């Protein structure tokens, strides 16, 4: 099970595409547990049996199609810019509405992404060997 459109820069006045697929299987019903980057297994809608249609405050449409496809459409609400939208389980899909880090040699670092800004950190004599995060048009980087 995949969410082919993993993370991505959804913008203002925008509807989001996210297609759960499983071509090497056979399906039945699919859920779409929501969240924030921290709170947990929240929810959205789903399908039932093969396909029996779909609180009270919940623009997070869905429309199961083939035993294969079924996407969730989100039409730009104010900025909550992600939470692994997920659909057996599938990978994660980010959203949004910011880079240039530092690295060092011999520990790493990724910095540069009211406002409310952040930082995220990690860390770790053979020749030129290598060691190489996220932001979510598009984004990705490293620190060889």
């Amino acid at each position: 099970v995949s969410q082919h459109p993993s993370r991505v820069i959804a913008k203002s006045g925008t509807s989001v595409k996210i297609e759960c697929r499983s071509l090497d299987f056979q399906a039945t019903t699919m859920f779409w547990y929501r969240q924030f980057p921290k709170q947990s297994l929240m929810l959205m809608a789903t399908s039932a049996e093969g396909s029996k249609a779909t609180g009270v405050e919940k623009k997070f449409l869905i429309n199961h199609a083939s035993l294969t496809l079924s996407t969730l459409t989100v039409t730009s609400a104010h900025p909550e810019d992600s939470s692994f939208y997920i659909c057996y389980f599938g990978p994660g899909t980010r959203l949004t509405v910011p880079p240039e880090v530092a690295v060092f040699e011999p520990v790493c670092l990724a910095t540069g992404f009211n406002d409310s800004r952040y930082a995220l950190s990690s860390r770790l004599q053979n020749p030129r060997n290598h060691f190489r995060v996220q932001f979510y048009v598009t984004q990705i980087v490293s620190a060889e």
């Binding site: 399906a27 249609a53 199609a65």
Partner: protein, 200 residues
């Protein structure tokens, strides 16, 4: 069976689907209220389709009767079968393209829909327009200035058949709506003259 809201988004859910389009299949066995067609060349070993049609709808087909499936489903797996209502007409022997002439009231719609059968189920016709209308005019969408609307298929025998564009019965699942196709109501092209779509 109530409410503007729930309906628009009661249909959009299922009319956003991919129909089975297995051409020239063979009927395993037929019984009461249903038809058993073979799709083991489109879907593999042991794979079949089951058409829940009207008693009248059956006794119209039997053992090996090359037929053509084309219908939207109401649920999913069992393992070797595929579920629907009707949409099973005789298999097309030669190839043909039938550009449909039509009108719209609320542009022009000639040659913007193309059937491929001389004898064509209503399910299909039904379907192919809805999508066109969805795709192009976004109707079953939360956003939309369309309360009601229906399709009027017209024959060479002065007779506009009706089709309700904005209708969603009892509960509201795929079974609650695709049942309107259990009648296996067909139509011959040489007797089809055009379609008048009305958006209100």
């Amino acid at each position: 069976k109530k409410d503007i809201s729930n309906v628009k988004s009661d249909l959009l859910y299922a009319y956003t689907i991919t129909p089975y389009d297995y051409k020239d299949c063979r009927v395993n066995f037929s019984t009461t209220h249903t038809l058993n067609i073979d799709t083991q060349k489109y879907r593999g070993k042991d794979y079949y389709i089951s058409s829940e049609m009207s008693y009248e709808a059956s006794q119209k087909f039997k053992r090996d009767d090359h037929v053509d499936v084309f219908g939207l489903f109401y649920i999913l797996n069992s393992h070797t079968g595929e579920y629907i209502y009707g949409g099973i007409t005789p298999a097309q022997n030669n190839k043909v393209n039938h550009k449909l002439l039509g009108n719209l009231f609320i542009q022009n719609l000639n040659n913007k829909i193309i059937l491929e059968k001389d004898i064509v189920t209503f399910q299909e016709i039904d379907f192919k327009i809805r999508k066109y209308l969805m795709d192009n005019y976004k109707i079953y969408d939360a956003t939309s200035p369309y309360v009601s609307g229906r399709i009027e298929i017209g024959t060479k025998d002065g007779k506009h058949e009706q089709i309700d564009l904005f209708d969603s019965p009892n509960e509201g699942t795929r079974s609650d709506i695709f049942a309107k196709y259990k009648d296996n109501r067909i139509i011959n092209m040489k007797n089809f003259s055009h379609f008048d779509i009305y958006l209100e």
